[PDB]
Amino acid sequence: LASVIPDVATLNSLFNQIKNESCGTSTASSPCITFRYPVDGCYARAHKMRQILMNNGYDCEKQFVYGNLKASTGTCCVAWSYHVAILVSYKNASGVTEKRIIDPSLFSSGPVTDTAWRNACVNTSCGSASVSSYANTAGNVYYRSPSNSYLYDNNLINTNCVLTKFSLLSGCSPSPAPDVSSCGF
């Protein structure tokens, strides 16, 4: 298991592998990743992206951002108290380590800097918005509270259950998302 991806070609491959699992595509396996439904389930999307990296022999970090968050899909807005995505480390063309967020719910075309990512979580086309804090964690953290408490989903039982519950959903409705209380760990 490697924390640093060896090159940009591999980072791009991994991005494509993640995008290929998006709900709405012919290419995805069960459960598809519900990037088109940004209302909720970010934690599950992130952990499923991490599973794809691990399938490939890589791990990553999570970045959690907290605040009065607002994001747009291009036709509707969602409001969040937190968001999470995977923060991938890789070696650039001269062997120096760089990091990028992968989050196709906000950036469908490729990896982006964490500063661009956090700014998309405070999108003022959806009204007032601000970041109160952000934190990086090991990838294995499923959720991090603003008080630095961790929860885990090591066998992806919660992840897969939530993704399945949200499988048919798209856009910014329904909001709140349907109940996922019955999904275990």
- Can you say whether the dihedral through the CA atoms of 117, 18, 49, 180 is positive or negative? positive
Select the span of 12-20, 42-50, 120-128, 129-137 touching Na ion (CB under 5 A): 42-50
Q: How far is the CB of 62 from Na ion (least distance, A)?
A: 12
Least distance CB 78 / Na ion (angstroms): 9
Nearest distance, CB of residue 74 and Na ion, angstroms? 18
* Residue 86 binds Na ion, judged by CB under 5 A: no
Q: For residue 152, what is the enclosing H or E element?
A: strand 150-152
87 binds Na ion, rule: CB under 5 A: no
The pair of structure tokens assigned to 39 is 């209302």
14 vs 85, beta carbon nearer Na ion: 85
Any idea which residue has 């109940």 for tokens? 179
The CA distance from 65 to 71, in Å, is 13
DSSP 57: T
CB of 54 to Na ion, least distance (A): 21
Which of 54, 46, 41 has its CA nearest to residue 3? 54
Is residue 42 a contact point for Na ion (CB under 5 A)?
yes
Site residues (vs Na ion, CB under 5 A): 40, 42
